[PDB]
């Protein structure tokens, strides 16, 4: 259950990351256009049967069940894996943009104060 909940939450986080990346791209485009305009303004068993007996059955059965579940987990794990990797790259890619944007505004404001006098 914890595995499944983690998977779904990761999916939601990825969608949110894509949304914020789109927002950042829009911010950059709009700000650049605005600045330019303003400038233009100017398996058989698991235990030995030492004594047979009912106790030896369920134990074996239990082990068998365990094996099954573990198999599933493997796939789950690996699947979930891919997700985070992509996210990593995506996150980094926004930062640069934002940073660049920030820098621009500062210089823009500086210019807006240097042309006046």
């Amino acid at each position: 259950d914890a595995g499944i909940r983690t998977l779904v939450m990761l999916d939601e986080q990825g969608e949110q990351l894509e949304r914020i990346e789109e927002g950042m791209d829009q911010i950059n485009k709009d700000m650049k256009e605005a600045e330019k305009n303003l400038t233009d303004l100017g398996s058989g068993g698991f235990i030995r049967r030492v004594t047979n007996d009912a106790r030896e059955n369920e134990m074996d059965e239990n082990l068998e069940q365990v094996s099954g579940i573990i198999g599933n987990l493997r796939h789950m794990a690996l699947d979930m894996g891919n997700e985070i990797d992509t996210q990593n790259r995506q996150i980094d890619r926004i930062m640069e943009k934002a940073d660049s944007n920030k820098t621009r505004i500062d210089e823009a404001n500086q210019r807006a104060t240097k042309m006046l006098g």
């Binding site: 573990i70 990593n88 404001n109 807006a112």
Partner: protein
């Protein structure tokens, strides 16, 4: 048949363990990065708002 099944189970367990190693480390790094970017964007928005407010007040003073 014993050795095959038991070693197979152990191998599966080890595979899961190693995957979780790598990706717990990855998620920790990602958390640090997100921590940085949040403050970055907050400062950016605050500064742009402040500068544009200066622009409004100056232009209205001149006109």
């Amino acid at each position: 048949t014993r050795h095959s099944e038991i070693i197979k189970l152990e191998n599966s367990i080890r595979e899961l363990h190693d995957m979780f190693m790598d990706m717990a480390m990855l998620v920790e790094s990602q958390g640090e990065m997100i921590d940085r970017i949040e403050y970055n964007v907050e400062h950016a928005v605050d500064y742009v708002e402040r500068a544009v407010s200066d622009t409004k007040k100056a232009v209205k003073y001149q006109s």
